[PDB]
Amino acid sequence: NSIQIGGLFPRGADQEYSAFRVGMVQFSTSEFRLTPHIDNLEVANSFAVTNAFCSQFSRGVYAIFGFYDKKSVNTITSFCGTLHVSFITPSFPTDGTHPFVIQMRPDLKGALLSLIEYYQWDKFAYLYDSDRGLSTLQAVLDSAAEKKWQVTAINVGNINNDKKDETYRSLFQDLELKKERRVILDCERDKVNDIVDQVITIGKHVKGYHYIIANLGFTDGDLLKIQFGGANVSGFQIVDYDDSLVSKFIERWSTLEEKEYPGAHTATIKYTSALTYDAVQVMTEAFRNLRKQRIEISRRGNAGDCLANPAVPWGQGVEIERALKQVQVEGLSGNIKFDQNGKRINYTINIMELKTNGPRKIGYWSEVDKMVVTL
Amino acid sequence: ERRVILDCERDKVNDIVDQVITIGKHVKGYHYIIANLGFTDGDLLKIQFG
Amino acid sequence: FPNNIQIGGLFPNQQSQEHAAFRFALSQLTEPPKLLPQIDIVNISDSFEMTYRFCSQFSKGVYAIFGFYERRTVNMLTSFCGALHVCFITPSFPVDTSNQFVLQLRPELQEALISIIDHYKWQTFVYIYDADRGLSVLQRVLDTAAEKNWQVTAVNILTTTEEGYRMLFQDLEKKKERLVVVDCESERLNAILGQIVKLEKNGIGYHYILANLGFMDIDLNKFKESGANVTGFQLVNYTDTIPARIMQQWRTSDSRDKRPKYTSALTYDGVKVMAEAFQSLRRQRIDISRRGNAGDCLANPAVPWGQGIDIQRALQQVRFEGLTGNVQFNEKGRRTNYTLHVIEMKHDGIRK
Ligand SMILES: *[C@@H]1O[C@H](CO)[C@@H](O[C@@H]2O[C@H](CO)[C@@H](O[C@@H]3O[C@H](CO)[C@@H](O)[C@H](O)[C@@H]3O)[C@H](O)[C@H]2NC(C)=O)[C@H](O)[C@H]1NC(C)=O
Ligand SMILES: *[C@@H]1O[C@H](CO)[C@@H](O[C@@H]2O[C@H](CO)[C@@H](O)[C@H](O)[C@H]2NC(C)=O)[C@H](O)[C@H]1NC(C)=O
Ligand SMILES: *[C@@H]1O[C@H](CO)[C@@H](O[C@@H]2O[C@H](CO)[C@@H](O)[C@H](O)[C@H]2NC(C)=O)[C@H](O)[C@H]1NC(C)=O
Ligand SMILES: *[C@@H]1O[C@H](CO)[C@@H](O[C@@H]2O[C@H](CO)[C@@H](O)[C@H](O)[C@H]2NC(C)=O)[C@H](O)[C@H]1NC(C)=O
Ligand SMILES: *[C@@H]1O[C@H](CO)[C@@H](O)[C@H](O)[C@H]1NC(C)=O
Numbered sequence: 146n147s148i149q150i151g152g153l154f155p156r157g158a159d160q161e162y163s164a165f166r167v168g169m170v171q172f173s174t175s176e177f178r179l180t181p182h183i184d185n186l187e188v189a190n191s192f193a194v195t196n197a198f199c200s201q202f203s204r205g206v207y208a209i210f211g212f213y214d215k216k217s218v219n220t221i222t223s224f225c226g227t228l229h230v231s232f233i234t235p236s237f238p239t240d241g242t243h244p245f246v247i248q249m250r251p252d253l254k255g256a257l258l259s260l261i262e263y264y265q266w267d268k269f270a271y272l273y274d275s276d277r278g279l280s281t282l283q284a285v286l287d288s289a290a291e292k293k294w295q296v297t298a299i300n301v302g303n304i305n306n307d308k309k310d311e312t313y314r315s316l317f318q319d320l321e322l323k324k325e326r327r328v329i330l331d332c333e334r335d336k337v338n339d340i341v342d343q344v345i346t347i348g349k350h351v352k353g354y355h356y357i358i359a360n361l362g363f364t365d366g367d368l369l370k371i372q373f374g375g376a377n378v379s380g381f382q383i384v385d386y387d388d389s390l391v392s393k394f395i396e397r398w399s400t401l402e403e404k405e406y407p408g409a410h411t412a413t414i415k416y417t418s419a420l421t422y423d424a425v426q427v428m429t430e431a432f433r434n435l436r437k438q439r440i441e442i443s444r445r446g447n448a449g450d451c452l453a454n455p456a457v458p459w460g461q462g463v464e465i466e467r468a469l470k471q472v473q474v475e476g477l478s479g480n481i482k483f484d485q486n487g488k489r490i491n492y493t494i495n496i497m498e499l500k501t502n503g504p505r506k507i508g509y510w511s512e513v514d515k516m517v518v519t520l
Numbered sequence: 521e522r523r524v525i526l527d528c529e530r531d532k533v534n535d536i537v538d539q540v541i542t543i544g545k546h547v548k549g550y551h552y553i554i555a556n557l558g559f560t561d562g563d564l565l566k567i568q569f570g
Numbered sequence: 571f572p573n574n575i576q577i578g579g580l581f582p583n584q585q586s587q588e589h590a591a592f593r594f595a596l597s598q599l600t601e602p603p604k605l606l607p608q609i610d611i612v613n614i615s616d617s618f619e620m621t622y623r624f625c626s627q628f629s630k631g632v633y634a635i636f637g638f639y640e641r642r643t644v645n646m647l648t649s650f651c652g653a654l655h656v657c658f659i660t661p662s663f664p665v666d667t668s669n670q671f672v673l674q675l676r677p678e679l680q681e682a683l684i685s686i687i688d689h690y691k692w693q694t695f696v697y698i699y700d701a702d703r704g705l706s707v708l709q710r711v712l713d714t715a716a717e718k719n720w721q722v723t724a725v726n727i728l729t730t731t732e733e734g735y736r737m738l739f740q741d742l743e744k745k746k747e748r749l750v751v752v753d754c755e756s757e758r759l760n761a762i763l764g765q766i767v768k769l770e771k772n773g774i775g776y777h778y779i780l781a782n783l784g785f786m787d788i789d790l791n792k793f794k795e796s797g798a799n800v801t802g803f804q805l806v807n808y809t810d811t812i813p814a815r816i817m818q819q820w821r822t823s824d825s826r827d828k829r830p831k832y833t834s835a836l837t838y839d840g841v842k843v844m845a846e847a848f849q850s851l852r853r854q855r856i857d858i859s860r861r862g863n864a865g866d867c868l869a870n871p872a873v874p875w876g877q878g879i880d881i882q883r884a885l886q887q888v889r890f891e892g893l894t895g896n897v898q899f900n901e902k903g904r905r906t907n908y909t910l911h912v913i914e915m916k917h918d919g920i921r922k
């Protein structure tokens with residue numbers, strides 16, 4: 146039983162679509178499947194997002210997988226709320242309780258603020274990118290007010306690539322006057338690399354320094370540069386490579402034709418792709434649960450247009466959203482459970498350090514228990 | 521040993537400078553003398569700022 | 571040019587000072603062109619409703635748009651304005667990243683706030699910021715805090731409760747000197763003032779700053795007795811000749827049918843901006859024509875309107891001494907070369 150599906154993918158994201166296709170083949174079955182209609186665009190152009198969302202809505206899509214950026218959150222969430230159309234994302238979780246939006250990415254503030262307390266930090270810088278909102282920045286500042294921390298928050302997201310070299314050096318020159326030996330690099334993979342490649346040049350990767358990479362993908366970057374400098378490097382990873390499902394997936398991943406699955410050959414997998422794969426699993430589980438439960442989901446006719454006065458949402462969307470939120474399965478990221486709001490719960494965020502041998506896990510973190518330490 | 525003389529040709533000087541950096545031995549304490557008649561020939565932009 | 575130059579309007583409330591000022595200012599329009607208000611009442615926060623209204627105005631063929639936007643729907647709107655090459659006038663909060671088709675009739679206070687804080691020997695202080703687009707001004711401060719080495723303890727009102735204020739002020743008064751900045755909206759400032767009047771507003775070394783472009787509108791009567799310092803900014807001078815005449819004529823007409831808020835003043839000025847641009851366009855004899863195609867905003871691909879570019883330039887070029895100040899526009903599309911009035915309110919004193 147084919148169920149129509151929609152897909153949005155940011156321009157220049159090759160690995161994620163490949164993981165989407167791999168998840169399709171893995172979870173596809175004779176009795177059930179998915180028919181995805183794909184669109185590629187610049188997710189930071191709300192106009193393009195609106196056009197794609199409306200086109201897919203006209204194409205009678207029951208749910209829409211996709212990504213979004215800080216300049217397209219509100220458009221997407223409003224459209225989903227008005228049209229009662231679901232949305233499944235591995236992108237940053239909303240700073241709110243927006244409905245009809247399932248979020249596959251776990252929050253990070255809890256683990257970050259626990260880790261900063263497992264190290265007894267009082268005076269640290271906080272380099273942040275102007276993306277995925279400033280929710281974690283605000284959390285850090287608030288906990289500073291409570292705990293009398295000394296935070297130097299600096300933005301690096303408005304730096305021109307052409308003149309990148311001059312600014313970073315002056316930034317660290319400023320930080321040196323305060324003896325800022327501790328830093329939190331709250332940025333995506335690319336800018337973390339572009340910064341680590343300028344800590345090295347100025348020799349600030351040495352015994353004295355400590356870096357915390359506030360990202361759910363720690364290995365994703367290039368850490369072979371700083372393994373040996375002598376400086377600490379801490380971070381978080383949801384994809385545990387010492388697991389069974391993960392190892393089997395890697396067996397299927399490395400043995401992949403990069404001519405067909407770009408990014409697939411490498412042994413590493415980025416958390417966005419992992420969450421995309423788990424998202425395919427989520428959709429299949431929810432839709433198959435609907436089929437078993439006999440819930441009636443079918444578009445008898447045509448959804449005229451996204452823009453229609455008055456807006457007339459089709460009333461089976463609540464069923465789809467409830468099914469998507471009411472699914473409990475294991476996957477690459479770990480255990481996937483949702484709330485009535487869509488945010489994930491009952492998840493474990495493994496913590497990692499950098500050692501000359503390589504990254505090694507030292508503990509984990511769960512919302513219920515605490516920061517937990519094993520090694 | 522904070523002082524070193526790299527008496528080698530361009531290629532091996534680069535292959536060594538690209539391993540002083542990795543281990544963070546291009547810092548205030550160290551001194552290097554590149555015993556070669558071509559000093560610019562290599563890539564010194566790596567260690568200008570260490 | 572045709573006198574049926576239809577203009578749009580996006581407003582949140584049918585009856586308000588801003589809407590009334592916009593309606594009134596058109597009466598003074600004696601130019602050959604006739605601008606239609608074509609008001610649509612739309613909820614600002616909801617991006618979908620707004621996209622519906624904006625595409626409806628596209629269907630009508632509107633040449634230019636005036637209205638408001640909030641944090642949630644700034645990006646959406648901005649994006650449509652840079653794609654269809656359609657201009658959008660606004661007195662709402664200005665933004666750092668924007669197209670050239672969005673004319674923001676509200677000068678940014680971030681630069682002046684930094685100067686005022688710098689002048690006073692401010693070593694450490696508390697910052698209070700509303701999430702309603704205030705974040706752009708936060709970063710500036712946090713960026714200047716590092717360069718110039720003062721401490722800033724930010725607290726958000728949107729996600730702060732009465733207990734939050736209580737704890738913040740209790741920890742604050744443990745310090746000998748108490749300095750506070752309050753960036754807020756027009757209406758949030760009144761509620762926060764009420765909150766501080768209850769307690770912690772005694773005036774014992776308390777120095778408040780109000781990052782609001784209009785400081786006369788706010789009812790700081792409760793602050794004229796407790797003996798507390800407050801500094802603020804003003805953009806509109808009522809005494810000057812042009813403001814005096816405008817206020818006299820407008821208030822006389824309205825009564826024949828109080829002091830306007832800064833938002834209402836900017837709303838009134840925007841009418842003058844649009845009228846000046848269209849008058850200069852008619853004078854310059856520029857070929858403006860609206861095709862009846864009225865293509866759906868969601869047209870793939872959406873061809874830019876050919877004339878819409880020049881309109882922008884015209885709207886950018888205009889310049890005149892308006893009510894608030896001298897109106898001008900930068901290349902980015904933002905108020906430039908303006909003046910603000912620093913104003914301290916003593917127990918009995920309004921000192922410029
Ligand atoms: C303009 O935008 C939207 C829709 O017009 C409005 O936001 C919506 O406001 C309603 C009522 O406050 C919210 O419903 C309530 O939400 C709270 C959570 O905030 C929940 O606890 C309640 O049970 C109830 O569901 C709704 O969630 C909210 N939607 C969004 C997307 O924010 C807004 O108030 C409108 N403004 C005006 C002036 O009409
Ligand atoms: C880099 O990592 C090492 C190892 O975790 C840190 O060294 C420890 O720090 C404690 C903190 O007081 C000191 O007593 C010892 O030097 C080490 N003890 C233990 C149990 O590891 C080092 O401090 C880290 N660098 C920074 C800048 O935090
Ligand atoms: C690196 O270069 C600097 C500058 O030449 C050296 O610093 C000088 O060394 C002398 C030697 O005793 C000291 O008195 C001062 O620190 C500096 N004086 C002058 C006149 O430059 C530094 O010693 C060099 N590093 C090494 C390892 O030799
Ligand atoms: C910046 O604004 C001031 C307004 O105070 C402009 O000064 C006026 O400029 C016009 C145009 O040259 C003159 O006709 C007025 O006599 C000036 N008045 C005053 C009080 O200076 C100034 O020209 C503007 N700057 C720019 C570059 O446009
Ligand atoms: C929820 O978390 C537990 C650990 O707290 C783990 O066994 C698994 O992820 C989930 N188990 C449940 C929900 O029983």
Ligand SMILES: *[C@@H]1O[C@H](CO)[C@@H](O)[C@H](O)[C@H]1NC(C)=O
Pocket residue numbers: 775776777799916
């Ligand atoms: C408050 O105002 C007084 C003048 O009334 C002046 O000393 C200074 O501006 C402020 N002094 C404080 C807050 O101690």
Ligand SMILES: *[C@@H]1O[C@H](CO)[C@@H](O)[C@H](O)[C@H]1NC(C)=O
Pocket residue numbers: 804807808809810811911922
């Ligand atoms: C308003 O302008 C008059 C003169 O035009 C001046 O005397 C007065 O100080 C101004 N008011 C403010 C608040 O700047």
